[PDB]
């Protein structure tokens, strides 16, 4: 389309190193049943652990983006009804503007 | 959960200019590195045929036959075309 564009490929760590310092409980020390409402967090197709109350973890990233601290390209999705946090950086994602 | 819709755009990547070259630059840059060897492995004691890269890149963008020369069609036939100058729009 006209408005459409494409990801170029950002870097993870500045979001990884950002996360584990705002809630994410590393996967090394994870215990299933102990956390059922576990909304395990994903980034560029990797499981870097989980995180409890995500409601905030989300609107924190969103406004982190909307300022320019997280490349406005990068995409992060919250699949509530499945307790999953999808965050992408990948190079090749078609995207419009709204 | 239903099966996974193979045709969901958010799961389709569009390898553009850079990426494509990237690929080339790698596989090529290695044939150079494994040829820089052939100079030392003979030095019983200036060896950089820069042409390799230069020519390679042409060949590719030239035809469109990415994966390279030799005895193989190996590449994806049809990348890199001749811009259309039929109209501005087109």
């Amino acid at each position: 389309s006209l408005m459409s564009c494409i990801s170029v490929g950002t870097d993870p760590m500045p979001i990884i190193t950002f996360l584990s310092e705002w809630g994410m409980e590393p996967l090394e020390d994870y215990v299933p049943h102990q956390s059922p409402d576990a909304t395990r967090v994903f980034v560029n197709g990797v499981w870097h652990g989980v995180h409890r109350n995500p409601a905030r973890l989300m609107e924190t990233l969103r406004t982190l983006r909307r300022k320019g601290d997280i490349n406005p390209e990068v995409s992060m999705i919250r699949d509530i009804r499945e307790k999953e946090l999808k965050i992408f950086t990948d190079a090749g994602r078609v995207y419009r503007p709204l | 959960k239903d099966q996974d819709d193979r045709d969901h755009f958010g799961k389709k990547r569009l390898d553009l200019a850079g990426p494509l070259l990237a690929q080339l630059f790698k596989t090529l840059f290695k044939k150079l590195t494994k040829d820089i060897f052939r100079y030392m492995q003979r030095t019983v004691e200036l060896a950089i045929n820069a042409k390799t890269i230069t020519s390679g890149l042409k060949y590719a963008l030239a035809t469109g036959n990415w994966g390279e020369q030799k005895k193989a069609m190996s590449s994806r036939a049809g990348v890199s075309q001749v811009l259309n100058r039929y109209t501005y729009s087109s």
Partner: peptide, 30 residues
């Protein structure tokens, strides 16, 4: 995409299995 390839990407490729049994530093684009 090209920009990206040139600026960053370009450099990253050169630095990986580069070094031999000789090293490769920065890269210039004239």
């Amino acid at each position: 995409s090209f920009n990206q390839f040139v600026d960053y990407t370009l450099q990253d490729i050169i630095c990986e299995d580069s070094t031999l049994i000789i090293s490769f530093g920065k890269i210039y684009v004239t």
